Structure 1
């Protein structure tokens, strides 16, 4: 399963994912490709920011879906 993470600067992060890696893990997956500390992450889906401890299939994200990555200053 693959999902799409889009940044404001116009980058499309194709992730390799399975239905309920919690949102910590995907934020940890993002840290491994772009080096971004989760401290500074905000993930959005359908206009909703994904609280962690929860997870993907809970937010009903199937294949070929698009998410937004919004960066926080530290």
Structure 2
């Protein structure tokens, strides 16, 4: 299925995912598509910071849901 990911510049990308994808899977797909290291990605859905071991379905992410991607440097 397709989901959308929205950045702070307004840009929106489409990703191919399954409900069983974990957040780490999604970050890996953003790496593949956009070249962003997973450690520089912060994903948000429904006002929650998304955790690497939980699935899209755990957060109620569905076909055509929109996540937010914020880039950060590693805190250290």
TM (norm. structure 2) is 0.92
Once the 2 structures are TM-superposed, how far is the Cα of residue 19 of structure 1 from its aligned partner? 0.6
Count of residue correspondences: 74
Q: Any gaps of 5 or more consecutive residues in structure 2?
A: none
Partner Cα distance (2:48, 2:58) in 1:
13
RMSD between aligned residues: 0.8
Partner Cα distance (2:53, 2:15) in 1:
20
Deviations 1:9-50 (A, max 9, x none): 111110111111111010000001110000111000011110
> Which residue number in structure 1 is paired with residue 43 of structure 2?
43
TM (norm. structure 1) is 0.94
Partner Cα distance (2:50, 2:63) in 1:
17
Q: Any gaps of 5 or more consecutive residues in structure 1?
A: none
Once the 2 structures are TM-superposed, how far is the Cα of residue 55 of structure 1 from its aligned partner? 1.1
Partner Cα distance (2:38, 2:64) in 1:
23
